[PDB]
Amino acid sequence: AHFKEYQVIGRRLPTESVPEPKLFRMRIFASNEVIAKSRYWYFLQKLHKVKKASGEIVSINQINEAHPTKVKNFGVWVRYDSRSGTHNMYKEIRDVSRVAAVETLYQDMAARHRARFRSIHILKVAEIEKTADVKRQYVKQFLTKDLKFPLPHRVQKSTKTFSYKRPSTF
Amino acid sequence: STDSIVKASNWRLVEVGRVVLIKKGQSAGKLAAIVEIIDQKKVLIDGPKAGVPRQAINLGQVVLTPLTFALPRGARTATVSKKWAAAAVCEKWAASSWAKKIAQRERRAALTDFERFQVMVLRKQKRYTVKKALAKA
Amino acid sequence: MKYIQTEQQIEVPEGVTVSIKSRIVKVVGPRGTLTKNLKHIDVTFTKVNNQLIKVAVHNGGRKHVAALRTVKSLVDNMITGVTKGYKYKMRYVYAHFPINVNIVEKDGAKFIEVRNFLGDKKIRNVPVRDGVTIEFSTNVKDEIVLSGNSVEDVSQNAADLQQICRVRNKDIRKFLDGIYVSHKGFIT
Amino acid sequence: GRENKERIFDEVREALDTYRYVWVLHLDDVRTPVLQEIRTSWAGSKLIMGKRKVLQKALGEKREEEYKENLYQLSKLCSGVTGLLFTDEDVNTVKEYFKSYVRSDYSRASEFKVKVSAYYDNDSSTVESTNIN
RNA sequence: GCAGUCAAGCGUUCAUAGCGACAUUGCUUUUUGAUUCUUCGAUGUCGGCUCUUCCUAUCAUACCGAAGCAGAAUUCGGUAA
RNA sequence: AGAACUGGCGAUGCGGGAUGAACCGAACGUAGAGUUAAGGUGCCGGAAUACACGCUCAUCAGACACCACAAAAGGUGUUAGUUCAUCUAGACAGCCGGACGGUGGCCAUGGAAGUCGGAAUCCGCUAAGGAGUGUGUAACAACUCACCGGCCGAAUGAACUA
């Protein structure tokens, strides 16, 4: 769905002889509140020894975008499980907000590389502040000064099954 | 007669300061200006004087109008509203024959049945002058 | 990768004039006129100023961009074919049987007649196309010269003329009877 | 490779103090046995060749930075493929030499002759320009 | 049974013009098995004669490509029923 | 061919898999109305020729579990990638200007000088030029690249992954 980036905070268990377990937080892209609590215990089990029964969730917080209307260049690091052994991947996305770029990444991996939702691990999404270090090319061609291009051959969506004009393009 | 007669094939082209008209969605027939291009299909539009909020949209939902003006890329909404009024694009929109056609089919929707009857009587009186003005040449 | 636009440049000298409606190309100059039909290649031509003409493809794939360079190379051969003009010179290697090559005319059809090739009684006919003039080399032995405006009219007629003399059922290392292209040069 | 360019960058610099005269020669059509006897007949001279944009930068293409002074004027005088020479015995001898020097070459029976354009002296710090064919 | 791929020895020199051992992956039911599925109140259960059609994994004919192809005569391969 | 646990079919229709004892959904008194399951919405065929991001062009495409077949190995077809390197002190490609001396080292000798053959293997001058890649002359002569430079004006090359 439309993803929402969340902040999930976890605290193992206040037990006798160890008060105050340390704390842990993560940034989770997910569709709703119920997934991102369960997606939190997916990663955080792999990093150290807790479980869902041995742990508890402190608080979740929805992080809205700091600047929606400003247009950003985003670099994403991706670890995905292919049919062979898994491997890294770095891709660059020119999009509007943080959580909208991950929307167009899961489409991009599914289209080109056939990776589903369950195979991909979003490593880190960072904003490239200055230009001219944009490494990929397809992001870079939109960065020239005074960019102008037409849209040739536009189609027209007709509501009637018959039209009498013998229609023409643009 | 010693020139290159190559045709122009002029086109409306997306750029910063290209004013657009939104056909489908929540907006539905309000002007807006392209603030900044994103990629092949998505652009960032705004019209403050029209009332459409600033948002990022796909170019399927919009159609390009041949009017332009100068606007610096990445401009904010308060910057756009001054350039919008200074070019007077809202006055320049109503000068077109395409803005008349939209208001023409709009006015035909809101006709009272008695007002629709008056169109009948006047179109009878009009054609009687035409058929005499014709067939004398 | 869906290049946003690519373009090339067509240089036009002083003596020639071009005229382009939608994708029909007419090139007029000193030696003559040539035409070409480019409805299939899907491009856009644009004059800037009287000597340079930019071709353009907006939003194209790699198969579409690769055919944008060949629009340059096909119009440029129309330019040099009218200013300079194309001229091939072919020579015919014979082992024991000399070859008698002439130009004969049957109802205005201008047939090139290859006789006595490797001692064959068969008479072959290769038609001269429109806009190609064949003359035989004065005071240089064993040479046939093809000249014309267009490359595709000249070079195909040069390629037709060699494949009619191809050797069958024999070894080619011993037997070298045939007509070949020496080099591909200009008139002026 | 590139490390040859960073090498020849250095021995242009350190040649300036050891030899007082700096000679640069325009030489387009030469032979390698022609070059080696220009080398072996000048044992006092140290002859180091290289690429121009290296030899411009090793002399310094800007007027701001240089190894020794009044150095940027002599580097702009060279246009073609050049090979430097460093001797100190006389100014009269070397300009006499390559005018007297002649061999034959390709037409492309035809004589070959290398010619000089710009002279310099280190301890004097003044740049000289001439045209001998 | 047939086809791929790896190439050992060979073709005086040189793996790959031409032959080919075995590794390794397959296809076929024109093979023998394996099963005993349908038929045990009968499906008339060998070969030949006569006769039509189909498959191509091509012996000949057509047109080509390769060589350790001078011609002639062959060898190897391609589209091809 | 023979066992374990559970659900089924036999003993059972109904919607879906075109068709099918066993799969997915759901188990039945007679009717009206509302909403759904699995499956579907070009047309047959009830239902969006919906919306959105991409990929793919087959001179045998491909189309949805059980299920009605395909493997190893290849492909500057194409789109993404990773790891290395080279460059705006000018790359890769293209042309244009150099390409050398000791020394024909030697063993072969009917005849190879870097090169029909063969054990061997360095220095000088050197921007750079290999006791040397090939075209080939009985042998020489002669030519090229790889080693460098000048014009030349933006990225490129190599090996791999899916």
Curated annotation (Swiss-Prot), chain A:
The keyword Ribosomal protein applies. There is a cross-link at residues 124, 130, 148 (Glycyl lysine isopeptide (Lys-Gly) (interchain with G-Cter in ubiquitin)). It comes from the Eukaryota. The modification Phosphoserine is found at residue 31. Pfam families: Ribosomal_L18A. Gene3D superfamilies: 3.10.20.10. InterPro entries: Ribosomal_eL20 (IPR028877), Ribosomal_eL20_dom (IPR023573), Ribosomal_eL20_eukaryotes (IPR021138). One of its GO terms (cellular component) is cytosol. Component of the large ribosomal subunit (LSU). Mature yeast ribosomes consist of a small (40S) and a large (60S) subunit. The 40S small subunit contains 1 molecule of ribosomal RNA (18S rRNA) and 33 different proteins (encoded by 57 genes). The large 60S subunit contains 3 rRNA molecules (25S, 5.8S and 5S rRNA) and 46 different proteins (encoded by 81 genes). eL20 forms multiple interactions with RNA and proteins in the central protuberance, connecting components of core functional centers that are located far apart. PANTHER family: 60S RIBOSOMAL PROTEIN L18A. Component of the ribosome, a large ribonucleoprotein complex responsible for the synthesis of proteins in the cell. The small ribosomal subunit (SSU) binds messenger RNAs (mRNAs) and translates the encoded message by selecting cognate aminoacyl-transfer RNA (tRNA) molecules. The large subunit (LSU) contains the ribosomal catalytic site termed the peptidyl transferase center (PTC), which catalyzes the formation of peptide bonds, thereby polymerizing the amino acids delivered by tRNAs into a polypeptide chain. The gene is RPL20A.
UniProtKB/Swiss-Prot annotation, chain B:
Present with 45300 molecules/cell in log phase SD medium. There are 2 genes for eL14 in yeast. Its main location: cytoplasm. Component of the ribosome, a large ribonucleoprotein complex responsible for the synthesis of proteins in the cell. The small ribosomal subunit (SSU) binds messenger RNAs (mRNAs) and translates the encoded message by selecting cognate aminoacyl-transfer RNA (tRNA) molecules. The large subunit (LSU) contains the ribosomal catalytic site termed the peptidyl transferase center (PTC), which catalyzes the formation of peptide bonds, thereby polymerizing the amino acids delivered by tRNAs into a polypeptide chain. Component of the large ribosomal subunit (LSU). Mature yeast ribosomes consist of a small (40S) and a large (60S) subunit. The 40S small subunit contains 1 molecule of ribosomal RNA (18S rRNA) and 33 different proteins (encoded by 57 genes). The large 60S subunit contains 3 rRNA molecules (25S, 5.8S and 5S rRNA) and 46 different proteins (encoded by 81 genes). N-terminally acetylated by acetyltransferase NatA. It comes from the Eukaryota. One of its GO terms (cellular component) is cytosol. It is found in: Cytoplasm. One of its GO terms (molecular function) is structural constituent of ribosome. Belongs to the eukaryotic ribosomal protein eL14 family. Keywords: Acetylation, Cytoplasm, Ribonucleoprotein, Ribosomal protein. This is Large ribosomal subunit protein eL14A. The modification N-acetylserine is found at residue 1.
Swiss-Prot record, chain C:
Keywords: Cytoplasm, Ribonucleoprotein, Ribosomal protein. SUPFAM superfamilies: Ribosomal protein L6. Its main location: cytoplasm. Belongs to the universal ribosomal protein uL6 family. GO terms for molecular function: rRNA binding; structural constituent of ribosome. Coiled coil: none annotated. PROSITE patterns: RIBOSOMAL_L6_2. Component of the large ribosomal subunit (LSU). Mature yeast ribosomes consist of a small (40S) and a large (60S) subunit. The 40S small subunit contains 1 molecule of ribosomal RNA (18S rRNA) and 33 different proteins (encoded by 57 genes). The large 60S subunit contains 3 rRNA molecules (25S, 5.8S and 5S rRNA) and 46 different proteins (encoded by 81 genes). uL6 lines the binding pocket for eukaryotic elongation factor 2 (eEF2). The keyword Cytoplasm applies. This is Large ribosomal subunit protein uL6A. The gene is RPL9A. It is found in: Cytoplasm.
Curated annotation (Swiss-Prot), chain D:
Associates with the pre-60S ribosomal particle. GO terms for cellular component: cytoplasm; nucleolus; nucleoplasm; nucleus; preribosome, large subunit precursor; small-subunit processome. InterPro entries: Mrt4, Ribosomal_uL10, Ribosomal_uL10-like_insert, Ribosomal_uL10-like_insert_sf, Ribosomal_uL10-like_sf, Ribosome_Assembly_uL10. It is found in: Nucleus, Nucleolus; Cytoplasm. Belongs to the universal ribosomal protein uL10 family. Present with 18200 molecules/cell in log phase SD medium. Signal peptide: none annotated. GO terms for biological process: maturation of SSU-rRNA; nuclear-transcribed mRNA catabolic process; ribosomal large subunit assembly; ribosomal large subunit biogenesis; ribosomal large subunit export from nucleus; rRNA processing. This is Ribosome assembly factor MRT4. Keywords: Cytoplasm, Nucleus, Ribosome biogenesis. PANTHER family: MRNA TURNOVER PROTEIN 4 HOMOLOG, MRNA TURNOVER PROTEIN 4 MRTO4. Component of the ribosome assembly machinery. Nuclear paralog of the ribosomal protein P0, it binds pre-60S subunits at an early stage of assembly in the nucleolus, and is replaced by P0 in cytoplasmic pre-60S subunits and mature 80S ribosomes. The gene is MRT4. One of its GO terms (molecular function) is large ribosomal subunit rRNA binding. It comes from Saccharomyces cerevisiae (strain ATCC 204508 / S288c).
